[PDB]
Amino acid sequence: GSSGSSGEKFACDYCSFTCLSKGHLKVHIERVHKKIK
Ligand SMILES: [Zn+2]
Secondary structure: OOOOOOOOOOOOOOOOOOOOOHHHHHHHHHHHHOOOO
16 A cells, blocks of 8 residues: 555754644744754
């Protein structure tokens, strides 16, 4: 069939947070983290 490995999506590293949209991942580390070296 087709069903098998689900996911094929990247997630934030610093934290274990899962998003729905691609942009959400960006806007996330944008402020939620904003970790300045
Ligand atoms: Zn994060």
